[PDB]
Amino acid sequence: EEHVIIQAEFYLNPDQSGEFMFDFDGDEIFHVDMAKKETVWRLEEFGRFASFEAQGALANIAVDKANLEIMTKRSNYTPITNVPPEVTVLTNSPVELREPNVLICFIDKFTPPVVNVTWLRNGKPVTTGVSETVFLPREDHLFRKFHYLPFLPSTEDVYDCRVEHWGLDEPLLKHWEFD
């Protein structure tokens, strides 16, 4: 095999959350913002070569919800089994004091696709400049997700990626600090 493109979509009850994205060899080409009803390209350059009518995604999601309702009853209302995430914290590149860098929180192999991720600097939540990806598909039908935190390396700062998921007995913390 050489390359794989996947149109992955989902609808979740009772949260009523839906997602529509395209995957290319494990990376996201784009997803549709259900709220804003617009396509969001993973890398800005993508949207300069291709387009996608978001309305198409919205229609598919409404259908997925309708289909889920039938499947849920047909299954005799069997709910999904929570599969807790694996969490790893790493830097975009080797750190060096005063050199801008990015902290990456990688949440892997979990389901359902609902997770609460927070960044902590010396114990206090931080949200300035943070960004995240939507839920990415896994061949085993579990999910992956990335959270990012741009930062200026400091030997006095200690960061945590805090992850919450119904499959966890307790919220999880993954530590990282200059060293």
Binding site: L12, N13, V83, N92, L136, H141
Partner: protein
């Protein structure tokens, strides 16, 4: 504190390309919670239930000639089309690795020396990182993190080498990646 049962519906439309678009395989996978229950494989020509839950659907969709014909043309109307549209910035994407060498900032065992060869921001994921003690690949005492995705279409990988600081030695990290015609090399002044 929300312990209510969740019910998840997933649908994945897969396009697998072999040698350009010479051979293409279209696949529709319907997944309930975590079990794929229904599938349409372009190689089969029709829907087939993978689990009992998809049985009713497989029977219905197959009995829909028009629909069934549309799905049979997906490899062309869907797969090749999109591949054509995205090829330029996906299939052809190439970002050269940034290689840097340095000793681990944390050491256990103090007479040995843990050298780190960091290969950052590359794409595609296919890569070869090797160590050379002057002109002899130290195939031993080498541990790697393996391929790591950053989630932004760039990969990174660190290949550590356990060594013993000896005067006169010149370790070299050699990296081969499709983005470069010749391997990248980085020496470490001991």
């Amino acid at each position: 504190g929300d312990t209510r049962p969740r019910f998840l519906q997933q649908d994945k439309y897969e396009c697998h390309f072999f040698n350009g678009t010479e051979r293409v395989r279209f696949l529709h996978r319907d997944i309930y919670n975590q079990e794929e229950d229904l599938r349409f494989d372009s190689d089969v020509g029709e829907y087939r239930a993978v689990t009992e839950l998809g049985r009713p659907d497989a029977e219905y969709w197959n009995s829909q000639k028009d629909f069934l014909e549309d799905r049979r043309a997906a490899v062309d109307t869907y797969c090749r089309h999109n591949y054509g549209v995205g090829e330029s910035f996906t299939v052809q994407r190439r970002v050269e690795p940034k290689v840097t060498v340095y000793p681990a900032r944390t050491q256990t065992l103090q007479h040995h020396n843990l050298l780190v060869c960091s290969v950052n921001g590359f794409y595609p994921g296919s890569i070869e990182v090797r160590w050379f003690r002057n002109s002899q690949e130290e195939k031993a005492g080498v541990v790697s993190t393996g391929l790591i995705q950053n989630g932004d279409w760039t990969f990174q990988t660190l290949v550590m080498l356990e060594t013993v600081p000896r005067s006169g030695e010149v370790y070299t990290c050699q990296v081969e990646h499709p983005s470069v015609t010749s391997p990248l090399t980085v020496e470490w002044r001991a």
